[PDB]
C-alpha cells in the first residue's frame, strides 16, 4: 500500500542520515570506499561479501533495506570483515579492527537513541507479509 511506501520512504531517509553521519567521521575514513585490489592485492581473495558505507547508501537507494534489522546486517559485515582479513597484533591491523568495532558500536549507539521500536516492528510486519 502507499502508507507501507511511506513507511519505506522515512525508513531510507532515517539510513541515510544514519550512513552520512558515520562516513563524515574521520575514524571511519577507510570505510567509505570499497577496499581497492590494486591498494589491499590480498583482499578480494579472502573477503567473500565486501562491504562499505558507499554501497550501503546504494542498497538504501535500491531499496534494499526493508528493516534497520536488514541494515545492521550489512554494518556487521564492516566490522566482521574488518576484524577477518586484519587479525593480527601489528598496530597497522590492531587500529582497523578498533576503528571497525566502533563504527559497528556507534551505528548501534545511534540507532538505540533515535529508532522507535513501533517503526521497526511495523517495517518487520510489512516486510514478513510479502
Ligand atoms: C576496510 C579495510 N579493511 N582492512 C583494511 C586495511 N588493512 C591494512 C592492510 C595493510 N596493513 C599493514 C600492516 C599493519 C600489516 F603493516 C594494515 C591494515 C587497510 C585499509 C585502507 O587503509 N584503505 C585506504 C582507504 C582510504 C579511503 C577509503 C577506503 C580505503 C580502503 C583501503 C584501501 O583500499 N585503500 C586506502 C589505502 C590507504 C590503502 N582499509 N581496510
Known amino acids: ?18 550512513t552520512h553521519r558515520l562516513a563524515i567521521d574521520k575514524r571511519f575514513r577507510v570505510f567509505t570506499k570499497p577496499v581497492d585490489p590494486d591498494e589491499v592485492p590480498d583482499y578480494v581473495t579472502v573477503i567473500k561479501q565486501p562491504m562499505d558505507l558507499s554501497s550501503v547508501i546504494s542498497k538504501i537507494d535500491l531499496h534494499k533495506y526493508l528493516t534497520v534489522k536488514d541494515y545492521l546486517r550489512d554494518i556487521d559485515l564492516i566490522c566482521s570483515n574488518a576484524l577477518e582479513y586484519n587479525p593480527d597484533r601489528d598496530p597497522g591491523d590492531r587500529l582497523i579492527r578498533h576503528r571497525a568495532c566502533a563504527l559497528r558500536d556507534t551505528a548501534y549507539a545511534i540507532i538505540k537513541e533515535e529508532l522507535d521500536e513501533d517503526f521497526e516492528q511495523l517495517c518487520e510486519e510489512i516486510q514478513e507479509s510479502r
Open 1 to 18: 500500500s502507499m502508507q507501507e511506501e511511506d513507511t519505506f520512504r522515512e525508513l531510507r531517509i532515517f539510513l541515510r542520515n544514519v
